[PDB]
């Protein structure tokens, strides 16, 4: 019996920051309206492609683990906002970092995608030859947004987080997990007309709907994550009080609170950074994990509960048993290219087109 | 030790057929030019979305295996042409078929994606709780093509293939596999400007380049598949002559022939259907497997070698040990919706725009 220890962690938040005040200059919103409704104060807007965010997060995780490019046998990029479909963007991260031969694929399960990727990499390593893996959640959600619709435009942001996993005989890393999907929730969170469903030669094809039915998402998310977390805990043999830290998807602080309340988990165990970055889909969990470690929230031998949901409606939970080390082996100097524009300036073309079309 | 037997197989080829003669009515080609160069006589053009092709193939595989919707715990759709990015299309197949709760994700590794999906599902089943899985390769490549460029427009088509896997103690299904990626080949097969790299509000954004460097693809494909097949065989303990059937990606018959020649595998062991369907990316292997079974090419207890490559440049090989049954348990009556248009008529808008832009 083998395990996949989380030996490296890293993040990449692009520098250009879009404040609530910035949003209020082109939408009928206020900092007060956005913060009360969402708990978000800021979010990041990338000046580079998704794959560039993924690359920097990966570099940080690699330095954190001290692994070489030869040692990496598997790369998974969890994303719903890839630069390209042909080829995938895991191969772009691979090209950028000069990693030979590793399997490289993109995994799409919306914001549950990092958890799906962690589950997938862990089992691949347990059942076959893979010695180390790189699992990245990376998104440029700002690509998708309808800048005339305040209820969705204020929720989402860009960023990436990564881990490195290393094979070990010690009982650490992801233990049990339950991942799933409530396909009866498929239509309540969706961009149905970006993809091959869209008309390639319709001049109005950029003005797609971003469907978001908040009350239904809340209900299905709490149900799906809750039952997954229960299945994992029940199988683990831990009592609820033995969970030390919760690392949740960052969609909505009230969902996190309801999840913990219904499970009987103390509210102060859940790591929250939604106020800084908004909902970055697949990136939420790995950024939160990296920052929890940075901030001293996770101790050696802690039990972590990971919980996430996303469009699909995908869902999942996982139990991680931490090992000995909570400190990076090395730091990376890796940085994104210079950002020469403010967030408002980055978004200008899209905002202007969305308004004109309206 | 558990295994993932292939208990169901199925396919969906959309009915609208684009002949070489059809292509010669709008391109500077002839049936003679296309056939001599490519070995392709026909290909299919879908009148429906990728997810609809995936659904029908899945229905056939499900009837073939006799599994219920409750029994299915995992759905992977291997595709580079999904209807949507938010949500994924595995969740659409799940919705269409009323499969509760199963994990559902899209996997992008270009034409090697079905093999990646088979590897992934098999190891998930071996290392954790998943009892049955649905793995689908499905593509609508016709969405992407530059109808003014004869060297690429004649190569690609649409379709889907599926398998059902079932957990067993018997040593059957995928045994060893080696999947990988030569990221030095990333730029020789690519559509860099469909995805979030594209300008959403550029009116010319539909007129993207389809990069295809044939000689370089050939070289890297033979190298990558060849070495993967060798690693699998060497680890298997089989001699080369003990491989009964080869199920290869259908990109180019000369690649298949070179692969077998260099490995010392008899040419008549490789199943070929490229003449009927062209290159359907992730769908090639599962359609070929389904048709090999249909046509009596695979016997109980055969050793199969699967080999594939795709944009990335992704690559892989796998050894499958067949079990007892090569016959479906049941047939499905599932059909696509009525196709009211010829292939030429389906493509008319895109051809006309590509020509006008030129
Ligand atoms: Na504990
Ligand atoms: Na044999």
XYZ file of C-alpha atoms and ligand atoms in Angstrom:
718
model
C 0.000 0.000 0.000
C 1.354 3.349 -1.192
C 0.235 6.949 -0.651
C 0.693 10.307 -2.378
C 2.110 12.828 0.112
C 1.562 16.545 -0.609
C 5.239 17.577 -0.622
C 4.830 20.891 -2.437
C 2.341 23.740 -2.550
C 2.291 27.018 -4.470
C 0.161 29.798 -5.835
C -0.032 32.493 -8.501
C -2.374 35.462 -8.140
C -2.016 37.930 -10.949
C -1.190 41.451 -9.725
C -3.927 43.583 -11.355
C -6.557 44.085 -8.686
C -10.160 45.004 -9.410
C -11.704 46.567 -6.344
C -15.391 46.898 -5.635
C -15.008 50.623 -6.184
C -13.631 49.842 -9.645
C -16.732 47.738 -10.387
C -18.983 50.573 -9.189
C -17.585 52.856 -11.923
C -19.254 50.789 -14.682
C -22.036 48.828 -12.885
C -24.973 49.868 -10.707
C -23.174 48.626 -7.600
C -21.377 49.958 -4.552
C -18.628 48.526 -2.352
C -21.362 48.240 0.292
C -23.728 46.328 -2.045
C -21.008 43.895 -3.169
C -19.461 43.252 0.246
C -22.762 42.731 2.121
C -24.089 40.406 -0.565
C -20.863 38.428 -1.297
C -18.115 38.978 1.276
C -15.767 39.897 -1.596
C -13.668 43.067 -1.437
C -11.179 42.416 -4.243
C -10.408 40.002 -7.039
C -7.551 39.580 -9.494
C -7.700 40.028 -13.251
C -5.029 38.246 -15.245
C -2.986 40.045 -17.907
C -1.737 36.658 -19.139
C -3.259 33.342 -20.201
C -4.454 30.651 -17.803
C -1.449 28.480 -18.642
C 0.933 31.228 -17.497
C -0.784 31.390 -14.098
C -0.576 27.580 -13.925
C 3.149 27.650 -14.730
C 4.072 30.077 -11.951
C 2.012 28.199 -9.340
C 3.733 24.994 -10.471
C 7.171 26.586 -10.122
C 6.395 27.534 -6.527
C 5.137 24.015 -5.713
C 8.175 22.392 -7.344
C 10.634 24.528 -5.310
C 8.520 23.800 -2.227
C 8.916 20.022 -2.756
C 12.492 20.111 -4.077
C 11.625 17.739 -6.961
C 13.356 17.664 -10.331
C 11.714 17.703 -13.770
C 12.790 14.069 -14.319
C 10.972 13.050 -11.174
C 7.621 14.433 -12.384
C 5.630 11.677 -14.104
C 2.150 13.210 -14.270
C 0.726 16.695 -14.823
C -2.981 17.462 -14.420
C -4.356 20.946 -15.022
C -7.856 21.359 -13.577
C -9.485 24.198 -15.511
C -12.650 25.312 -17.247
C -10.891 28.302 -18.909
C -8.034 26.779 -20.926
C -5.997 28.900 -23.396
C -6.702 26.277 -26.056
C -8.534 23.018 -26.586
C -6.054 21.750 -29.188
C -3.668 20.980 -27.592
C -4.403 20.946 -23.888
C -2.703 23.387 -21.516
C -1.096 20.808 -19.241
C 1.268 20.274 -22.209
C 1.978 24.051 -22.186
C 3.010 23.948 -18.515
C 5.123 20.900 -19.425
C 6.759 22.769 -22.357
C 7.397 25.866 -20.247
C 9.106 23.892 -17.498
C 11.000 21.466 -19.753
C 9.492 18.395 -18.059
C 10.226 15.378 -20.273
C 7.764 12.602 -21.040
C 5.207 13.004 -18.199
C 1.554 12.217 -18.870
C -0.167 15.598 -19.274
C -3.933 16.218 -19.343
C -6.555 18.862 -18.611
C -9.396 17.839 -16.315
C -12.709 19.716 -16.363
C -15.020 19.362 -13.343
C -15.499 23.128 -12.750
C -14.555 24.327 -9.241
C -14.435 20.709 -7.934
C -11.697 20.060 -10.509
C -8.737 20.427 -8.188
C -10.265 17.859 -5.789
C -11.019 15.592 -8.772
C -7.388 16.030 -9.853
C -6.056 15.217 -6.389
C -8.215 12.070 -6.270
C -7.169 11.079 -9.769
C -3.437 11.625 -9.276
C -3.464 9.894 -5.895
C -5.121 6.764 -7.290
C -2.928 6.716 -10.418
C 0.099 6.802 -8.109
C -1.296 4.109 -5.813
C -2.164 1.687 -8.607
C 0.677 2.206 -11.057
C 4.190 3.525 -11.537
C 3.895 7.358 -11.180
C 6.472 8.579 -8.638
C 5.604 12.291 -8.427
C 2.733 14.364 -9.782
C 1.932 18.012 -10.402
C -1.750 18.919 -9.893
C -2.780 22.488 -10.703
C -6.082 24.352 -10.483
C -5.844 27.398 -12.790
C -8.472 29.791 -14.166
C -8.986 33.018 -16.100
C -12.712 33.285 -15.360
C -12.650 36.999 -16.294
C -12.751 35.814 -19.937
C -16.354 34.679 -19.522
C -18.115 37.436 -17.639
C -21.069 39.545 -18.797
C -19.939 43.006 -17.722
C -23.541 44.274 -17.807
C -24.784 41.749 -15.198
C -23.836 42.810 -11.688
C -25.030 39.672 -9.909
C -22.399 37.467 -11.672
C -19.732 39.990 -12.734
C -18.752 40.693 -9.119
C -18.277 37.043 -8.071
C -15.445 35.614 -10.127
C -11.715 36.109 -10.464
C -8.498 34.678 -11.801
C -5.635 32.733 -10.274
C -3.857 29.402 -9.878
C -2.749 27.026 -7.126
C -0.661 23.865 -7.347
C 0.588 20.884 -5.439
C 3.332 18.342 -5.920
C 2.601 14.807 -4.775
C 5.285 12.220 -3.939
C 4.872 8.490 -3.505
C 5.486 7.195 0.021
C 4.803 4.179 2.245
C 3.664 6.528 5.040
C -0.096 6.991 5.577
C -0.281 10.630 4.498
C -1.808 12.783 1.748
C -5.313 12.036 0.456
C -6.895 9.151 2.332
C -10.558 8.622 1.518
C -12.425 10.794 -1.007
C -15.926 10.865 -2.469
C -16.328 12.817 -5.703
C -19.571 12.991 -7.654
C -22.008 15.045 -9.688
C -25.670 16.077 -9.338
C -26.485 16.366 -13.035
C -29.980 17.615 -12.124
C -28.131 20.838 -11.284
C -26.438 21.135 -14.686
C -28.443 24.113 -15.947
C -28.341 26.374 -12.853
C -24.657 27.318 -13.341
C -23.594 27.443 -16.991
C -22.188 29.194 -20.048
C -23.920 27.009 -22.664
C -22.637 28.989 -25.703
C -18.910 29.072 -25.248
C -17.574 25.836 -26.729
C -18.414 23.839 -29.856
C -22.139 24.494 -29.189
C -21.521 28.122 -30.259
C -21.898 29.444 -33.783
C -18.340 30.098 -34.921
C -19.514 32.551 -37.588
C -22.148 34.551 -35.707
C -20.874 38.087 -35.190
C -22.794 38.328 -31.889
C -21.329 35.062 -30.543
C -19.296 36.860 -27.850
C -22.453 38.021 -26.039
C -23.269 34.765 -24.297
C -25.443 34.255 -21.243
C -23.857 33.330 -17.899
C -26.610 31.420 -16.152
C -26.474 31.537 -12.361
C -29.404 30.487 -10.140
C -27.982 31.280 -6.709
C -30.637 29.746 -4.434
C -30.587 26.455 -6.304
C -26.771 26.356 -6.411
C -26.735 26.914 -2.605
C -29.192 24.085 -1.941
C -27.500 21.537 -4.205
C -23.992 22.521 -3.092
C -24.747 22.092 0.614
C -26.492 18.763 -0.101
C -23.743 17.399 -2.348
C -20.726 18.532 -0.305
C -22.391 17.617 2.939
C -23.184 14.055 2.010
C -19.736 13.568 0.463
C -18.053 14.848 3.630
C -20.233 12.483 5.688
C -19.330 9.477 3.533
C -15.619 10.250 3.887
C -15.836 10.795 7.658
C -17.936 7.711 8.212
C -15.461 5.601 6.197
C -12.427 7.229 7.931
C -13.470 6.185 11.440
C -12.743 9.708 12.690
C -15.202 11.593 14.789
C -16.188 15.018 13.617
C -14.111 16.711 16.331
C -10.947 14.996 15.007
C -10.987 17.162 11.845
C -8.441 19.925 12.449
C -8.858 22.153 9.397
C -11.438 22.565 6.599
C -10.195 23.714 3.161
C -13.341 24.578 1.185
C -14.212 25.921 -2.204
C -14.527 29.732 -2.012
C -17.827 30.484 -3.762
C -19.924 31.916 -0.956
C -19.089 32.238 2.740
C -22.680 31.287 3.729
C -22.354 27.927 1.966
C -19.152 27.213 3.932
C -20.882 28.205 7.166
C -23.963 26.100 6.462
C -21.815 23.094 5.548
C -19.922 23.313 8.843
C -23.030 24.040 10.918
C -24.926 21.056 9.557
C -21.885 18.781 10.046
C -21.212 20.069 13.576
C -17.745 21.317 12.597
C -16.527 24.432 14.404
C -16.746 27.491 12.119
C -13.231 28.669 12.939
C -11.734 25.522 11.390
C -12.630 26.629 7.842
C -9.999 28.609 5.946
C -11.501 31.598 4.105
C -9.824 33.862 1.496
C -12.796 34.707 -0.727
C -12.606 38.337 0.395
C -9.259 38.733 -1.428
C -9.729 36.747 -4.627
C -13.404 35.956 -5.183
C -14.426 32.640 -6.752
C -11.482 31.372 -8.847
C -13.173 28.014 -9.659
C -10.580 25.177 -9.740
C -7.946 27.428 -8.165
C -9.872 28.008 -4.902
C -8.838 24.906 -2.991
C -5.135 24.842 -3.865
C -4.691 28.586 -3.234
C -6.508 28.152 0.123
C -4.315 25.156 1.033
C -1.117 27.037 0.145
C -2.204 30.087 2.166
C -3.347 27.993 5.142
C 0.161 26.498 5.271
C 1.780 29.970 4.810
C -0.306 31.345 7.704
C 0.404 28.556 10.236
C -3.110 27.106 10.120
C -2.036 23.506 9.457
C 0.161 21.474 11.836
C 2.135 18.272 11.240
C -0.155 15.198 11.404
C -3.378 17.283 11.114
C -6.522 15.854 9.560
C -7.883 18.090 6.827
C -11.324 18.001 5.241
C -11.439 19.296 1.666
C -14.876 20.090 0.245
C -15.870 21.577 -3.111
C -18.635 21.902 -5.677
C -18.943 23.515 -9.118
C -20.875 23.694 -12.346
C -22.277 20.259 -13.281
C -23.236 20.299 -10.489
C -19.999 18.533 -9.553
C -19.202 17.906 -5.869
C -16.712 16.230 -3.593
C -14.943 15.815 -0.288
C -11.648 14.347 0.770
C -9.733 13.568 3.955
C -6.034 14.448 3.951
C -3.673 13.301 6.694
C -0.759 15.713 6.821
C 2.801 14.448 7.244
C 5.831 15.948 9.001
C 6.605 19.083 6.979
C 4.573 22.291 6.716
C 7.505 24.466 5.501
C 8.756 24.818 1.904
C 12.144 23.275 1.119
C 12.909 26.186 -1.181
C 11.359 29.359 -2.497
C 10.913 30.154 -6.174
C 11.723 33.539 -7.698
C 9.300 32.800 -10.561
C 7.131 35.776 -11.506
C 4.611 36.615 -14.181
C 5.670 39.002 -16.948
C 5.322 42.708 -16.194
C 1.752 43.892 -15.879
C 1.559 47.242 -17.643
C -2.205 47.830 -17.212
C -4.713 48.310 -14.409
C -7.546 45.828 -14.023
C -9.978 48.379 -15.449
C -7.783 48.895 -18.484
C -7.409 45.132 -18.989
C -11.200 44.742 -19.017
C -11.923 47.885 -21.086
C -12.554 46.270 -24.496
C -14.904 43.634 -23.002
C -16.851 46.078 -20.814
C -17.240 48.503 -23.745
C -18.492 45.775 -26.089
C -20.914 44.312 -23.499
C -22.375 47.799 -22.876
C -22.637 48.718 -26.574
C -24.397 45.421 -27.353
C -26.868 46.214 -24.577
C -5.736 -6.918 -6.462
C -8.674 -5.827 -8.618
C -9.065 -5.191 -12.353
C -11.414 -3.246 -14.625
C -12.888 -5.604 -17.238
C -14.215 -4.065 -20.480
C -17.779 -5.416 -20.228
C -19.400 -3.035 -22.707
C -18.518 -1.376 -25.993
C -20.463 0.941 -28.292
C -20.254 3.549 -30.990
C -22.069 6.484 -32.570
C -21.213 7.680 -36.072
C -23.446 10.471 -37.228
C -25.241 9.667 -40.501
C -24.327 12.649 -42.728
C -21.457 11.472 -44.888
C -19.010 13.796 -46.609
C -17.383 11.999 -49.499
C -14.163 12.978 -51.196
C -16.229 13.974 -54.207
C -18.169 16.333 -51.935
C -14.883 17.919 -50.804
C -13.782 18.309 -54.433
C -16.797 20.562 -55.119
C -15.385 23.347 -52.903
C -11.625 22.567 -52.633
C -8.875 22.052 -55.206
C -8.897 18.309 -54.554
C -10.018 15.082 -56.173
C -11.055 11.712 -54.752
C -7.771 10.459 -56.235
C -5.698 13.189 -54.515
C -7.343 12.609 -51.119
C -7.305 8.806 -51.181
C -3.685 8.433 -52.381
C -2.431 10.962 -49.850
C -4.574 9.902 -46.827
C -6.325 6.557 -47.293
C -9.618 8.289 -46.419
C -12.685 7.833 -48.625
C -15.416 9.165 -46.333
C -15.944 10.895 -43.020
C -18.973 11.801 -40.930
C -20.226 15.286 -40.139
C -22.380 15.616 -37.050
C -25.718 17.446 -37.126
C -25.745 17.410 -33.312
C -23.394 18.399 -30.495
C -20.486 16.286 -29.271
C -22.393 15.380 -26.111
C -25.210 13.853 -28.176
C -22.742 11.581 -29.985
C -21.261 10.655 -26.587
C -24.712 9.818 -25.203
C -25.636 7.393 -27.984
C -22.267 5.601 -27.827
C -22.741 5.308 -24.058
C -26.223 3.838 -24.499
C -24.821 1.136 -26.772
C -22.014 0.310 -24.309
C -24.431 0.192 -21.365
C -26.775 -2.268 -23.155
C -23.694 -4.251 -24.193
C -22.609 -4.625 -20.533
C -26.106 -4.938 -19.044
C -25.286 -2.434 -16.259
C -27.795 -0.178 -14.534
C -27.506 3.578 -13.956
C -27.066 2.962 -10.203
C -24.094 0.747 -10.909
C -22.212 3.480 -12.802
C -19.905 5.352 -10.416
C -17.645 7.239 -12.829
C -18.075 8.954 -16.198
C -15.119 10.292 -18.188
C -15.606 12.031 -21.524
C -12.346 12.292 -23.477
C -12.769 15.206 -25.882
C -11.097 18.281 -27.305
C -14.377 19.556 -28.859
C -16.805 19.875 -25.934
C -20.211 21.596 -26.361
C -19.353 23.787 -23.376
C -16.593 24.445 -20.884
C -18.993 25.488 -18.113
C -20.192 22.927 -17.197
C -18.378 19.936 -18.619
C -20.097 17.549 -21.033
C -19.657 14.388 -18.978
C -22.383 15.937 -16.776
C -24.568 16.296 -19.918
C -24.237 12.578 -20.708
C -25.041 11.952 -17.027
C -28.147 14.207 -17.205
C -29.323 12.618 -20.452
C -29.074 9.100 -19.059
C -30.378 9.874 -15.559
C -27.267 8.451 -13.864
C -27.325 9.570 -10.218
C -24.308 10.790 -8.278
C -21.402 9.410 -10.383
C -18.179 11.402 -10.619
C -18.267 13.092 -14.039
C -15.347 14.848 -15.762
C -13.998 15.775 -19.186
C -10.425 14.743 -19.934
C -8.414 16.516 -22.638
C -5.343 14.738 -24.051
C -6.331 15.088 -27.747
C -6.525 11.785 -29.670
C -4.691 9.923 -26.845
C -7.562 10.946 -24.551
C -9.496 7.702 -24.703
C -6.356 5.751 -23.694
C -5.709 8.314 -20.934
C -9.321 7.827 -19.816
C -9.014 4.040 -19.811
C -5.817 4.279 -17.736
C -7.400 6.772 -15.371
C -10.645 4.863 -14.836
C -8.822 1.557 -14.418
C -6.539 2.932 -11.701
C -9.375 4.783 -9.932
C -11.253 1.472 -9.809
C -8.206 -0.466 -8.613
C -7.336 1.949 -5.813
C -10.746 3.027 -4.568
C -14.439 2.213 -4.468
C -15.687 2.707 -8.089
C -17.585 -0.419 -9.195
C -18.342 0.425 -12.840
C -17.202 3.209 -15.149
C -18.251 4.752 -18.442
C -15.342 6.010 -20.584
C -16.224 7.804 -23.818
C -14.131 9.331 -26.596
C -16.347 11.829 -28.469
C -15.555 14.587 -30.978
C -17.089 17.102 -33.375
C -13.799 18.060 -35.037
C -15.710 19.530 -38.012
C -16.282 22.600 -35.791
C -12.609 23.542 -36.061
C -11.675 23.103 -39.691
C -10.418 25.753 -42.123
C -12.493 24.943 -45.197
C -9.991 26.761 -47.438
C -7.045 24.510 -46.447
C -7.185 21.179 -48.245
C -4.286 19.537 -46.418
C -6.154 19.603 -43.043
C -9.819 19.879 -44.091
C -9.801 16.378 -45.596
C -8.338 14.590 -42.545
C -10.796 14.972 -39.699
C -14.282 13.792 -38.845
C -16.839 13.371 -36.111
C -17.970 10.461 -33.977
C -17.955 8.763 -30.580
C -17.025 5.424 -29.022
C -17.540 4.175 -25.477
C -16.743 1.418 -23.058
C -18.159 0.236 -19.768
C -15.688 -1.109 -17.233
C -16.617 -3.445 -14.356
C -14.560 -4.327 -11.313
C -13.418 -7.953 -11.128
C -10.865 -10.185 -9.394
C -9.998 -11.771 -12.765
C -6.826 -10.583 -14.547
C -8.541 -8.894 -17.486
C -9.020 -5.419 -18.979
C -6.137 -2.931 -19.001
C -2.984 -4.451 -17.555
C 0.094 -2.281 -17.978
C -0.033 1.139 -19.670
C 2.450 3.925 -20.362
C 0.944 7.320 -21.160
C 3.009 10.449 -21.701
C 3.572 13.652 -23.631
C 6.363 15.066 -25.826
C 5.761 18.749 -25.123
C 8.495 19.632 -27.643
C 5.834 18.685 -30.199
C 3.192 21.052 -28.806
C 3.244 23.552 -31.675
C 3.187 21.162 -34.672
C -0.496 20.217 -34.183
C -2.610 23.038 -32.755
C -5.511 25.480 -32.860
C -3.949 28.143 -30.604
C -6.836 30.661 -30.957
C -9.894 28.704 -29.999
C -10.139 28.878 -26.210
C -9.577 31.655 -23.670
C -6.474 32.746 -25.653
C -8.865 34.089 -28.332
C -10.218 37.618 -28.467
C -13.878 37.251 -27.545
C -14.758 40.556 -29.221
C -12.763 40.351 -32.454
C -15.169 39.989 -35.365
C -12.591 37.904 -37.275
C -12.036 35.505 -34.350
C -13.666 32.577 -36.191
C -10.897 32.503 -38.821
C -8.282 30.713 -36.758
C -5.251 28.819 -37.999
C -5.150 25.012 -37.775
C -1.452 24.273 -37.524
C -0.415 20.866 -38.835
C 3.221 19.935 -39.561
C 2.768 16.427 -40.945
C 6.391 15.245 -41.173
C 7.139 16.297 -37.614
C 3.903 14.770 -36.280
C 4.845 11.470 -38.019
C 8.334 11.405 -36.501
C 7.249 12.250 -32.952
C 4.206 9.961 -33.081
C 6.204 6.905 -34.160
C 8.860 7.679 -31.516
C 6.384 8.276 -28.692
C 3.992 5.394 -29.416
C 6.821 3.044 -30.198
C 8.698 3.565 -26.976
C 5.481 3.404 -24.940
C 4.517 0.109 -26.588
C 8.017 -1.229 -25.853
C 7.830 -0.231 -22.184
C 4.463 -1.968 -21.811
C 5.614 -5.133 -23.607
C 8.872 -5.296 -21.712
C 7.016 -4.923 -18.387
C 4.303 -7.449 -19.444
C 6.741 -10.318 -20.001
C 5.038 -11.103 -23.316
C 7.001 -11.598 -26.463
C 6.027 -9.527 -29.437
C 4.410 -12.511 -31.177
C 2.022 -12.971 -28.212
C 0.142 -9.754 -29.110
C -2.992 -10.866 -30.959
C -4.543 -7.577 -32.067
C -3.410 -3.930 -32.330
C -6.040 -1.189 -31.826
C -4.356 2.048 -32.942
C -5.255 5.669 -33.296
C -6.529 6.314 -36.849
C -4.595 9.393 -37.988
C -2.525 8.036 -40.850
C -2.198 4.456 -42.089
C 1.568 4.916 -42.708
C 2.145 5.744 -39.035
C 0.346 2.521 -38.033
C 2.425 0.550 -40.528
C 5.706 2.094 -39.402
C 4.855 1.465 -35.746
C 4.199 -2.223 -36.426
C 7.193 -2.631 -38.741
C 9.628 -1.158 -36.240
C 8.155 -3.280 -33.413
C 8.160 -6.472 -35.508
C 4.378 -6.835 -35.196
C 2.606 -8.395 -38.175
C 0.781 -5.723 -40.213
C -2.442 -7.718 -40.416
C -2.882 -7.535 -36.632
C -3.712 -3.804 -36.732
C -7.382 -2.869 -37.035
C -7.947 -0.064 -39.563
C -11.151 1.957 -40.186
C -9.685 5.336 -41.148
C -11.018 4.908 -44.685
C -14.608 5.194 -43.376
C -14.387 7.880 -40.704
C -11.107 9.778 -40.983
C -9.341 11.009 -37.842
C -11.975 11.406 -35.091
C -9.383 12.237 -32.373
C -10.419 10.710 -29.001
C -13.106 8.605 -30.686
C -10.678 6.618 -32.888
C -9.646 3.927 -30.430
C -13.044 3.135 -28.911
C -14.796 3.059 -32.308
C -12.004 0.759 -33.603
C -12.320 -1.510 -30.543
C -16.111 -1.728 -30.910
C -15.828 -2.521 -34.632
C -13.033 -5.062 -34.112
C -15.345 -6.920 -31.713
C -18.328 -6.568 -34.136
C -16.215 -8.018 -36.973
C -14.842 -11.069 -35.101
C -11.282 -9.749 -34.888
C -10.892 -10.256 -31.127
C -11.151 -13.661 -29.407
C -11.670 -14.535 -25.737
C -8.379 -14.269 -23.783
C -6.608 -12.281 -26.564
C -3.828 -9.834 -25.778
C -4.478 -6.429 -27.299
C -2.018 -3.588 -27.788
C -3.599 -0.128 -27.799
C -1.462 2.723 -29.128
C -2.307 6.393 -29.659
C -0.906 9.896 -29.981
C -2.415 13.375 -30.379
C -1.871 17.091 -30.088
C 0.468 17.896 -27.170
C 2.153 15.823 -28.429
C 0.441 13.313 -26.141
C 1.195 9.589 -26.543
C 0.505 6.217 -25.012
C 0.224 2.459 -25.171
C -1.625 -0.131 -23.169
C -1.914 -3.908 -22.917
C -5.430 -5.303 -22.526
C -6.085 -8.941 -21.660
C -9.536 -9.846 -22.923
C -11.896 -11.947 -20.809
C -14.545 -14.515 -21.761
C -17.162 -12.480 -23.637
C -16.867 -10.816 -27.048
C -20.660 -10.578 -27.653
C -23.012 -7.842 -26.384
C -25.493 -8.845 -23.679
C -28.096 -6.599 -25.268
C -28.530 -4.208 -28.148
C -29.652 -0.607 -27.786
C -32.247 1.014 -30.037
C -30.785 4.447 -29.206
C -30.492 6.734 -32.228
C -29.551 10.322 -32.893
C -32.332 12.767 -33.769
C -33.356 12.907 -37.424
C -30.719 14.341 -39.713
C -32.524 16.592 -42.172
C -29.435 17.897 -44.030
C -26.616 16.544 -46.176
C -23.042 16.948 -44.994
C -22.499 19.696 -47.565
C -25.544 21.565 -46.328
C -24.440 21.181 -42.696
C -21.063 22.731 -43.542
C -22.425 25.439 -45.886
C -22.292 28.447 -43.527
C -18.711 27.634 -42.419
C -17.390 26.945 -45.931
C -19.009 30.151 -47.245
C -17.541 32.272 -44.444
C -14.046 30.725 -44.764
C -14.072 31.411 -48.534
C -15.409 34.975 -48.217
C -12.773 35.816 -45.586
C -10.126 34.529 -47.989
Na -7.049 15.087 13.939
Na -1.668 -13.644 -26.706
